[PDB]
């Protein structure tokens, strides 16, 4: 039997990353040639990540640990406009590695919530040397961590537990959502992604809007839609790993002023969980399941998707 | 007359994204691809940009004005996916419309296609066949 699955969620919530894990778990993963096609995407994120941090230094008026680094910054900005997109020359990675070790750069990096920085900034930057080592070949995690804004609607198909999954991945930015209506017919189940770590961030579309509030408005509109009352709705509270770390330094009261619980993964995590589940108008008849997930973690995803698959399988024989 | 690309030509559309988009048949074949992934508004915006910079400079204020209405405006019919930074810079220059006003917006949508859409194109059947129907 066939099953139409929908991956919905705001921009940068983890959707495509899930797709990547489905490929790794139910599609024989990547080949060497494919793995290598990500090197440029990785060098691209890396650069864009260090560039944003650098620019934030002046925007947030933070000063370098060592004044010398100022030139390195200027020369990086230049090489950014002259080299070939998606490459990383020795003289460039040398400049990036020196900025990274700067105490002021780190201070700005720690304030990533104050501007727009890729989730994987610290992942790549921390290990740039490994990435530019001759003979470098991306690791699964390196691929999983790669960032590419997706536009449109893309289908990927795989079989599992004797079910033919037709999984549809969409774009999350506001302009892409008007295209979702084209897939609402015959939806067997919707996996809705929510970035747990978005509570102190603002949208790329509107830096005045909090990312989680945006996410809450979106989910509210989706779970309450005539086209899904007979569709399985699973909530993926994603980026647990990033969330359990910033919740130790950044108070959830930034998103919810009324929150009085402790700022710890467990309590704040459940508070966010509740605010989303309580958006359902008919939870009376239709229940919404939810898992704390880390889309970049294959084991967690393989586990959670197995559970999602059971839900589907069970809601079907009724 | 019809335009039937040769083996080489079709083959070099996979050398780099610009090669595929600088070719009329490339774009045309690329459009059939985006239409399937519901992201054809990006290639339309790109062209529109070209037609503004390299078109009759007599009606720039006219074109940009309607480009904003078709691709940039909130809820616009061919609404494109650009960030807020890139969107403000643009709405700013549209107060004094000129040829290279959509630069920022265009460079953005260019890379959007290049990193996401393009990649999947060279893998699609719509390309394998284009290549199979290659001359000599
Ligand atoms: N550490 C970490 N990164 C994640 C998780 N999920 C997505 N990411 C990263 O966040 C960025 C955005 O994810 P992506 O799949 O493109 O999101 P979507 O397509 O907007 O839903 C990518 O660089 C991913 O590697 C996560 O659970 N943990
Ligand atoms: F929602 Al996205 F890339 F931002 F898939
Ligand atoms: Mg995506």
């Amino acid at each position: 039997r066939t099953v139409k699955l929908l991956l919905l969620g705001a921009g940068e919530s983890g959707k495509s990353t899930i797709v990547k894990q489905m490929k790794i778990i139910h599609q024989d993963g990547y080949s060497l040639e494919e793995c290598l096609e990500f090197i440029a995407i990785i060098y691209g994120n890396t650069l864009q990540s260090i560039l944003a941090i650098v620019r934030a230094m002046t925007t947030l008026n933070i000063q370098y640990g060592d004044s010398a680094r100022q030139d390195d910054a200027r020369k990086l900005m230049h090489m950014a406009d002259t080299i070939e997109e998606g490459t990383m020359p020795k003289e460039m990675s040398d400049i990036i590695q020196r900025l990274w070790k700067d105490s002021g750069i780190q201070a700005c990096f720690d304030r990533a919530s104050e501007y727009q920085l890729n989730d994987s900034a610290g992942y790549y930057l921390s290990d740039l040397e490994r990435l530019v080592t001759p003979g470098y070949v991306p690791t699964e995690q390196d691929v999983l961590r790669s960032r590419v804004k997706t536009t449109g609607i893309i289908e990927t198909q795989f079989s599992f537990k004797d079910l033919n999954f037709r999984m549809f991945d969409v774009g999350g930015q506001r302009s892409e959502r008007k295209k979702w209506i084209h897939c609402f017919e015959g939806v067997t189940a919707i996996i809705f992604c929510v970035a747990l770590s978005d509570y102190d961030l603002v949208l790329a579309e509107d830096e005045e809007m909090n990312r989680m509030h945006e996410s809450m408005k979106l989910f509210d509109s989706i779970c309450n839609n005539k086209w899904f009352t007979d569709t399985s709705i699973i909530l993926f509270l994603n980026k647990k790993d990033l969330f359990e770390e910033k919740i130790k330094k950044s108070p959830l009261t930034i998103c919810y002023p009324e929150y009085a619980g402790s700022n710890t993964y467990e309590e704040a995590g459940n508070y966010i969980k509740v605010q989303f589940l309580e958006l359902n108008m008919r939870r009376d008849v239709k229940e919404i399941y939810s898992h704390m997930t880390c889309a970049t973690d294959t084991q967690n995803v393989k586990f959670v998707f197995d559970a999602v698959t059971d839900i589907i399988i069970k809601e079907n024989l009724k | 007359l019809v335009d039937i690309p040769t083996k080489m030509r079709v083959e070099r559309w996979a050398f780099n994204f610009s090669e595929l988009i600088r070719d009329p048949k490339g774009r045309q074949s690329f459009q059939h691809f985006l239409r399937k992934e519901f992201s054809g508004e990006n290639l339309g915006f790109w062209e529109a940009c070209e037609d503004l910079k390299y078109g009759d400079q007599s009606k720039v204020k006219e074109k940009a004005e309607e480009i904003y209405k078709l691709f940039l405006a909130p809820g616009a019919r061919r609404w494109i996916n650009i960030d807020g930074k890139t969107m403000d810079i643009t709405v700013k220059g549209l107060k004094h419309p000129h040829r290279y006003v959509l630069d920022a917006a265009q460079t953005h949508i260019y890379m959007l296609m290049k990193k996401d859409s393009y990649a999947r194109y060279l893998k699609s059947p719509i390309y394998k066949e284009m290549l199979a129907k290659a001359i000599e």
Side-chain angles (χ1 to χ4, degrees):
Chain A
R1 191 74 296 280
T2 291
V3 296
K4 194 195 217 69
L5 198 55
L6 279 190
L7 281 173
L8 304 194
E12 295 176 277
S13 49
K15 305 185 300 294
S16 278
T17 297
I18 290 302
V19 178
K20 272 193 253 305
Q21 301 274 28
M22 294 300 100
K23 184 182 198 305
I24 297 177
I25 312 174
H26 304 132
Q27 303 196 319
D28 298 305
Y30 298 74
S31 67
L32 188 62
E33 64 208 302
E34 292 178 300
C35 280
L36 300 179
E37 302 183 322
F38 284 103
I39 294 186
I41 292 186
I42 287 161
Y43 288 177
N45 297 164
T46 303
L47 181 61
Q48 300 308 140
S49 283
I50 188 61
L51 287 180
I53 299 184
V54 166
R55 298 204 197 80
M57 291 292 277
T58 62
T59 293
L60 304 173
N61 191 47
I62 296 178
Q63 64 111 55
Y64 292 78
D66 178 351
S67 202
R69 295 297 72 76
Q70 282 203 60
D71 295 69
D72 287 306
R74 284 187 294 256
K75 182 173 182 181
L76 213 197
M77 289 283 270
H78 200 197
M79 303 184 66
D81 297 307
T82 61
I83 86 164
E84 176 183 353
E85 192 290 309
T87 62
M88 183 64 60
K90 178 70 179 188
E91 60 184 306
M92 176 173 259
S93 39
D94 286 319
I95 292 173
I96 290 174
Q97 287 194 66
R98 262 177 294 147
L99 290 164
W100 188 243
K101 291 163 191 173
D102 191 70
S103 77
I105 280 287
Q106 283 302 298
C108 184
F109 167 71
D110 287 353
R111 294 171 56 177
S113 67
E114 274 159 72
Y115 43 105
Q116 294 298 308
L117 187 64
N118 312 54
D119 302 67
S120 302
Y123 175 86
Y124 292 131
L125 288 178
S126 291
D127 222 359
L128 183 50
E129 187 51 43
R130 168 177 67 90
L131 306 187
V132 300
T133 290
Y136 171 67
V137 169
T139 62
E140 300 214 306
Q141 187 63 194
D142 284 342
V143 175
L144 287 169
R145 290 272 198 161
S146 63
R147 165 67 185 161
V148 173
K149 198 204 302 196
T150 55
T151 185
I153 302 183
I154 301 74
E155 165 180 48
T156 187
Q157 297 169 174
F158 57 106
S159 171
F160 179 53
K161 285 184 176 187
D162 294 320
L163 296 179
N164 283 80
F165 288 84
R166 280 169 62 66
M167 182 176 289
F168 294 96
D169 183 12
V170 308
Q173 285 71 35
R174 294 171 176 185
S175 79
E176 306 271 343
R177 303 173 200 166
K178 59 186 299 162
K179 309 176 181 174
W180 292 7
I181 188 60
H182 295 309
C183 283
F184 291 10
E185 310 160 7
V187 185
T188 304
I190 297 175
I191 286 177
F192 193 100
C193 301
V194 169
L196 282 171
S197 52
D198 276 350
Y199 72 93
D200 59 354
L201 303 173
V202 285
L203 284 183
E205 303 91 309
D206 185 339
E207 301 195 62
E208 287 296 291
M209 179 71 129
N210 171 288
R211 293 217 174 194
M212 190 153 269
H213 290 163
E214 176 77 0
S215 188
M216 282 183 66
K217 278 187 174 185
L218 190 56
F219 182 73
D220 182 1
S221 175
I222 282 293
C223 92
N224 298 310
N225 177 298
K226 303 294 178 181
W227 293 96
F228 313 128
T229 291
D230 294 300
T231 306
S232 307
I233 289 179
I234 308 81
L235 194 64
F236 271 20
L237 281 332
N238 202 37
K239 294 175 193 186
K240 178 224 171 199
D241 60 318
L242 298 181
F243 174 71
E244 76 208 332
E245 297 301 331
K246 67 155 55 172
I247 188 55
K248 304 177 188 169
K249 305 176 162 185
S250 182
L252 177 66
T253 50
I254 293 171
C255 183
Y256 301 115
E258 83 286 356
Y259 182 62
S262 64
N263 283 301
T264 54
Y265 163 60
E266 305 183 301
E267 279 206 58
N270 292 308
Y271 196 73
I272 292 168
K273 179 176 169 181
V274 171
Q275 306 316 303
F276 276 91
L277 294 178
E278 276 181 32
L279 289 165
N280 192 179
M281 318 178 298
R282 294 306 324 171
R283 55 175 160 173
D284 170 298
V285 50
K286 191 197 190 67
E287 182 204 5
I288 295 174
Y289 323 82
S290 68
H291 293 79
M292 301 303 252
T293 67
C294 319
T296 41
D297 187 302
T298 305
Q299 319 186 329
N300 169 263
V301 184
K302 182 168 172 288
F303 178 85
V304 175
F305 195 68
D306 183 280
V308 160
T309 304
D310 288 338
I311 291 173
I312 302 177
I313 280 185
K314 177 192 176 186
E315 288 300 308
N316 174 57
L317 48 70
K318 294 257 65 62
Chain B
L1 191 64
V2 65
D3 183 354
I4 296 173
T6 64
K7 185 77 171 176
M8 183 168 266
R9 183 182 181 182
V10 184
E11 292 196 310
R12 57 187 183 66
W13 287 351
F15 178 97
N16 173 57
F17 182 54
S18 73
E19 289 298 354
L20 166 68
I21 201 165
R22 291 290 174 182
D23 184 318
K25 264 311 299 173
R27 295 210 299 290
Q28 198 176 71
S29 182
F30 185 51
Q31 173 184 53
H32 295 185
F33 181 67
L34 312 187
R35 294 262 196 60
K36 278 188 179 175
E37 288 192 353
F38 298 94
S39 62
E41 74 276 2
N42 293 136
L43 181 43
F45 179 76
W46 187 79
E47 299 199 305
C49 288
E50 295 299 73
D51 147 286
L52 178 59
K53 307 190 295 178
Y54 305 162
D56 185 8
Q57 308 292 290
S58 75
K59 307 178 171 188
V60 164
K61 181 263 189 177
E62 188 188 68
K63 289 178 174 176
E65 194 166 298
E66 194 220 306
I67 288 174
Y68 164 90
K69 180 178 169 173
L70 181 56
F71 304 84
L72 307 164
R77 204 166 38 177
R78 303 197 78 173
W79 208 2
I80 56 166
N81 189 325
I82 54 177
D83 61 53
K85 187 193 174 185
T86 299
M87 177 62 113
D88 292 340
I89 303 177
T90 298
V91 174
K92 184 175 183 180
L94 293 188
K95 303 198 68 179
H96 300 321
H98 69 294
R99 39 171 19 186
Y100 296 67
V101 76
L102 312 186
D103 272 15
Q106 167 168 48
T107 296
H108 192 91
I109 300 305
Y110 180 68
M111 289 285 131
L112 172 67
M113 299 187 269
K114 180 182 181 179
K115 298 281 190 170
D116 193 41
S117 297
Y118 180 54
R120 284 190 294 298
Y121 173 67
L122 301 315
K123 293 284 205 302
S124 68
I126 299 183
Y127 176 75
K128 291 179 186 173
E129 292 173 359
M130 199 67 45
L131 193 62
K133 310 155 191 176
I135 295 178
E136 285 182 47

